[PDB]
Every structure is written in C-alpha cells, then in structure tokens.
Amino acid sequence: VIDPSELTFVQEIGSGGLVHLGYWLNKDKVAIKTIREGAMSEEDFIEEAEVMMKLSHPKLVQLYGVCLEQAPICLVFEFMEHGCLSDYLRTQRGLFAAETLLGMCLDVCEGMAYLEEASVIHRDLAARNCLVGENQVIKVSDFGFPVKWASPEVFSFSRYSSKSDVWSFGVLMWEVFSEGKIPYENRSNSEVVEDISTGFRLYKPRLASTHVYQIMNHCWKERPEDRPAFSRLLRQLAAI
Ligand SMILES: CN(C)CC[C@@H](c1ccccc1)n1cc(NC(=O)c2n[nH]c3c2CCC(C)(C)C3)cn1
Numbered sequence: 001v002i003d004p005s006e007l008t009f010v011q012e013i014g015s016g017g018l019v020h021l022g023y024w025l026n027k028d029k030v031a032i033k034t035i036r037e038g039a040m041s042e043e044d045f046i047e048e049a050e051v052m053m054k055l056s057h058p059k060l061v062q063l064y065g066v067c068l069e070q071a072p073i074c075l076v077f078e079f080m081e082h083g084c085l086s087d088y089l090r091t092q093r094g095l096f097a098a099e100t101l102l103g104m105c106l107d108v109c110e111g112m113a114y115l116e117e118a119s120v121i122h123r124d125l126a127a128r129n130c131l132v133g134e135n136q137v138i139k140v141s142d143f144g145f146p147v148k149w150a151s152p153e154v155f156s157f158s159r160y161s162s163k164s165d166v167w168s169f170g171v172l173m174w175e176v177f178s179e180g181k182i183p184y185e186n187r188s189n190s191e192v193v194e195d196i197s198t199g200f201r202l203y204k205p206r207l208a209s210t211h212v213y214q215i216m217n218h219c220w221k222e223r224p225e226d227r228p229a230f231s232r233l234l235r236q237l238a239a240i
Contacts (some may be wrong), residue, residue, distance in 0.1 A: 002065040002076050007032060013083075021079065029079040030064065033142070035072040042073050048144025049075060055118060059111035061131055061139045080131035080139060088132045089180030096179060098207045100136070105173050106237045107138035112169055113230035115140070116162045123160055125149060125168035127175040147189040148182075152222060155193050163224030169233070170219025177205040177212065211240065 008023040009032065017039070022032040035045055045066075052063035062078040082088055085104070089096075108130055115122060122129075122143045129141045145155070151167035153159040171183055183202060184192045201220050204213040215236055221227045228236070 002067045004067055004069050007067065007074075007076065022076075024064070024076065031077045031079045032067075033075040033077060034070070035074075045073055045075060048142065051120060051144040052142065055114070055120070057111060057114035059107050059137070059139050060114060061141045063142070075142075077142070078139075080133045080141075082132035082136075084128055084141075085130035085132055085138060086127040086175065086180055089127060089176065089178075093179040096207070098177075098209065098212075101176050101179075101207055102212070102237070102240060104136075104138045104176050106234075108140055108169065108172060109230060109234050109237050111140035112165060113234045115143075115165070116230040121160045121162060122165050122168070125165055125172055127172055127180065130172070145189060147192045148184055151224065152196050153224060155196070159224075161224055162230065163227050166219050166224070166227045166230065166233070169230070170216045171202070173208075173212070173216050173219070174202050174205060177208040179205075179207070181205070 006025055007030070008026060010021045010023065013019050013021045013031065015036065017036040018034045020032045020034070022030050024030045035042060049063060049066045053065070056062060061080060064076045064078065067074045067076060112122070112125070120143065122140065124143070124146055125140070126146060126149045131139050131141050133139060147155050149168040149171045151164040154164045154167070174183060175181070184195060187195070199222070201217060204210075208216070215233065218228055219233070
C-alpha cells in the first residue's frame with residue numbers, strides 16, 4: 001500500500017484507463033494508472049492488483065503497489081521509457097533487423113512463460129499491450145472484442161487457457177515481424193471469425209524467415225492441444 005503523499009502526478013501519458021507519469025518519493029519515475037470515470041470498477045482494479053502483486057519477472061511490467069487512499073484508487077507501475085510496442089514498431093519501421101525483432105519476441109515469450117508457470121492467463125496479449133524499456137527491452141503489460149488476437153475457442157466459446165495466449169503470441173510475433181502492421185488488413189471482427197474458422201492464416205512477413213514463420217503457424221493450430229506451450233516456444237526461439 002502506497003501512501004498518496006509518496007506520489008507526484010506529472011503529466012498524462014495514456015488514456016482509454018488514465019495513465020500519468022509520476023515520481024515516487026520525488027526521485028524515481030513511475031506510471032500511475034487510475035480508473036476511468038466509471039468505465040470499470042475499483043474491485044476490478046483490486047483484482048488486478050491481487051494477481052499482479054504476487055508476480056515478478058524482468059519481462060513483465062512490475063506493479064509496485066496500490067494507492068488505496070486515492071479516489072478512485074490507483075495502481076503504481078514500473079515506468080517504461082518508450083511506451084507501447086505497437087506505436088514503437090510503427091514509428092521506427094524500416095530500422096529493424098530480423099535479429100532485433102526476434103529478440104523482442106523472445107522477451108515477450110520469456111514473460112509469457114513466467115505467466116504460464118504461475119497459472120495466469122493474460123487474455124489480451126497483443127503488441128499494443130507490450131511496452132518498450134531501456135535498451136529496447138520488451139515487457140508484457142498489465143493483466144488481471146479483440147478478435148484479431150483471439151484463438152477460435154476464445155472467439156467462439158470464451159475458453160481461455162495458456163494455449164489461447166499462445167495463439168495471441170503468434171499474432172504478436174506477426175505484428176513484430178511486420179513492424180506494426182494491423183493483422184487481417186484490419187477486417188471486421190465478423191470477417192476475421194469467418195477467416196480463422198475456415199482455416200485462413202496470416203501470410204509471412206518479409207522479415208520473418210521460413211523457420212520463424214513455421215513457429216507462428218504452430219501457434220495458430222485450431223485445437224489448443226496442438227499448439228506449443230510457452231516453455232516449448234521459449235526453447236525454440238532461444239535456439240535460433
Ligand atoms: C515518445 N513516445 C513514443 C514515448 C514517450 C514516453 C514518455 C512519456 C513521458 C515522459 C517521458 C517519456 N512514454 C512512456 C510511456 N510509458 C507508459 O505508458 C507506461 N510505462 N509503464 C506502464 C505504462 C502504460 C501501462 C502501465 C500498465 C500503466 C504500465 C508512455 N509514453
């Protein structure tokens with residue numbers, strides 16, 4: 001529990017919740033997330049915190065604490081210098097070597113393999129939900145309808161698992177290797193459901209080798225039983 005007097009709100013850096021750049025004990029930068037008017041409840045925030053406060057891994061954005069004596073309450077996170085991965089890919093497009101893109105996927109895979117070990121389902125993995133830090137390190141952002149990133153059992157039946165996160169991770173790999181292109185030419189959710197149900201899959205980005213592309217396709221097997229766990233993907237990505 002963080003006392004409100006320990007935080008300084010500097011400026012807005014995000015909204016959709018609201019996020020501010022702040023300082024913690026007037027020295028260190030933090031990202032302070034507050035609930036948006038009434039978009040979501042405080043109990044939801046509390047549930048996120050109860051999950052995230054038990055977790056710590058270098059490729060997961062860290063939740064430092066909760067400020068209970070704010071109205072509404074706020075969550076205090078690790079500040080990620082360069083913002084969201086989706087914007088970063090798009091903004092720096094044409095400057096990335098394949099090896100760099102691979103390293104970004106490995107970062108995320110490491111975060112996700114930790115979540116998998118910890119029995120936590122992300123449920124909304126996407127480049128827009130990854131952040132870029134110092135030295136271009138990628139970290140997975142917070143957790144606790146996006147059809148374009150959803151496995152067929154998720155879009156059809158809300159059947160979430162680590163294996164549905166695997167499907168999402170395959171799409172994220174496609175985003176990374178495509179330098180922030182929007183999956184499925186930004187087709188509608190109805191059309192994407194129809195695409196994936198019939199067996200359509202995303203085509204190979206230029207910067208993805210044949211080998212990388214087969215790992216992506218493995219992530220997009222129709223049955224979750226047929227997709228690799230994150231522990232197995234991590235060994236595959238690390239061996240490249
Ligand atoms: C140039 N532009 C692309 C990046 C600008 C950058 C920034 C912002 C203010 C002061 C210095 C640098 N910036 C850095 C962020 N970081 C975050 O939004 C962030 N850092 N940690 C978290 C978040 C957003 C999501 C979170 C769950 C609150 C955790 C946003 N903008």
